[PDB]
Amino acid sequence: LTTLDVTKLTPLSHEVISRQATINIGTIGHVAHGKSTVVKAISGVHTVRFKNELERNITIKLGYANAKIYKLNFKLVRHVSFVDCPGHDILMATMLNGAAVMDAALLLIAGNESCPQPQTSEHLAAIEIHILILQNKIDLVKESQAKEQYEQILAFVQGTVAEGAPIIPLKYNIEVVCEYIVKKIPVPPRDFTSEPRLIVIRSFDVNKPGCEVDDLKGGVAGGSILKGVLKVGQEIEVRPGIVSKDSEGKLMCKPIFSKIVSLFAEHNDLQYAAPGGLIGVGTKIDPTLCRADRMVGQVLGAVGALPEIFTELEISYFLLRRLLGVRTEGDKKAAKVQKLSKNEVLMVNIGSLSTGGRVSAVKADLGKIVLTNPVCTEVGEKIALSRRVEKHWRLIGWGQIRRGVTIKPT
């Protein structure tokens, strides 16, 4: 059983006290829903099944996969989480907006061909930044395997300018790769002493239909802790809160304060919480206020974090000319990032929080975009800008937050 407690002063990244989730690792590759088999064989099939509802944005939500690497009746050396979502553009936008995203990179590249998909994956990995490639072409000819290894070595030599120094080759090879990763997994610096800060990526309410008179447990939001350490029983605050425009004028965004009743991981998480995982905080919030995925796009703070609610923000427009790492064979203006036209709707993804906005005005220096919903992230965070080419939102450029119009409702 777990050996957790409620006694800790300076948390350690490699401490065995928690043994639940230490570092969030990403798995980026062109597997195209083929990395699921590798992830399952690494950790488990359905180890995380505690709350499911009608999926809201399956293709625009990152999914974690905890994995406790145990070796030596054995001992767990480390317990990390694997993150892999469909669409490398969203992951790259999330990564290039600060830090604490895919601390360890695993590339489950195919060892059969060297098509443009591996090149795009390598370009995305380079733009996001330690990476570890892998050859998934099992059950093939030994000479063909050697030829594919030589081709992958050539590609790695080409990519060594940015990141091209990996080494890899029915789960024996998978176990060897896991052991090598555990050996080479650098410890990342995470601040456990700062004020609590989390981003909610999935809101839930486990109260099934026809509940009891008083047995009404509600307010179990889910997300990832950005900075600090969260303890059960603390008074958490929702930075976004309830935003209502019924005042026949400027919208009023009143935050919500609730005592953190419990904190649960895929397993039974301790009272204290460690950053780098998709943990859920259940508080004294009304289930109506947080319906199925209703409270998404919110920031949970302890003492009212510095992130202030904003309505319109001025960004420093800076986009890429062509498509980063992507170039169609026809190239019939498809892989050509057009100029930032006015009245164009696009999302800015700060960390894991993605908000929508239209470019009301911009002249070569700073676009004043009025956000879709009020947001509270930071005052100078590097905000990315992504636009949908065709049914797939992709990064268009970067910018910096300078000023804007803020609101503070009580």
Partner: protein, 275 residues
């Protein structure tokens, strides 16, 4: 098989009585007195209505029951004459209630006779003379007395046991009365969305729900279920729907007061209603 509901044979004058029309003649309309073992009766054409009426068929409607007063009785010749002009709507209402209660009593007695398999009509007449008409004579109020006694027997079986018919016959009568004079079934449902998007949201919601449910007395347990996230259904399966509606209204008022006190949200999705 069938007999007169009351021991009395010829109804007195100025007594509103149920009839069933059968045919039309020149002198008037032929009827059967349904509750007096279907004795023949007459309604004079000159008494059908206060207005000027030329055709008897304008209001006869052979095969349709009616409420007619009795204007003249002649026991010697077996002639009874009835009327429709004299009867008031209130008199018709009370006579209809009398007829319904007498029909219920006769259904109970006929079921008892069928259970006893009394193929003799004399046995059934004696059953009427002994079982039900005893309370009619005791109460000195025909019609209502039998139904009131049967209701009391369904409540307290002392009245049924006091009859001197038999032992097995008494058990059959008690079973028939229970199956017939005890049709209690009610379930009052209501919907209200009680939720407080404040500091102690779930806590305040649970406290308000408990306070509201505390008003549910015995034999009326108000059970609250979470049909939806923000809405809750309160169900009270109890008899006396007239009092049940008041109880549900009081509980709703208490819940609304509790929700408003803690600065929350309370909406009345639907008023209490039967299921």
């Amino acid at each position: 098989l069938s007999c007169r509901f009351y021991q009395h044979k010829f109804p007195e004058v100025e007594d509103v009585v149920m009839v069933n029309v059968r045919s039309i003649a020149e002198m008037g309309a032929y009827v059967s007195l349904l509750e007096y073992n279907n004795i023949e009766g007459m309604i004079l054409l000159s008494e059908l209505s206060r207005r000027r009426i030329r055709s008897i068929n304008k209001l006869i409607r052979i095969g349709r029951n009616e409420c007619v007063v009795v204007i003249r009785v002649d026991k010697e010749k077996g002639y009874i004459d009835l009327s429709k002009r004299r009867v008031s709507p209130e008199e018709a209402i009370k006579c209809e209630d009398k007829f319904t209660k007498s029909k219920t009593v006769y259904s109970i007695l006929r079921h008892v006779a069928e259970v006893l398999e009394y193929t003799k009509d004399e046995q059934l007449e004696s059953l009427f003379q002994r079982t039900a008409w005893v309370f009619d004579d005791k109460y000195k109020r025909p019609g209502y007395g039998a139904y009131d006694a049967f209701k009391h027997a369904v409540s307290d079986p002392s009245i049924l046991d006091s009859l001197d018919l038999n032992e097995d016959e008494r058990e059959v009568l008690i079973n028939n009365i229970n199956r017939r004079l005890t049709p209690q079934a009610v379930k009052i449902r209501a919907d209200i969305e009680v939720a407080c998007y404040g500091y102690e949201g779930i806590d305040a919601v649970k406290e308000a729900l408990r306070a509201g449910l505390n008003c549910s007395t015995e034999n009326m347990p108000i059970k609250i279920n979470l049909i939806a996230p923000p809405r809750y259904v309160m169900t009270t399966t109890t008899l006396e729907r007239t009092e049940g509606l008041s109880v549900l209204s009081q509980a709703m008022a208490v819940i609304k007061e509790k929700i408003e006190e803690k600065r929350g949200v309370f909406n009345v999705q639907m008023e209490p209603k039967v299921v």
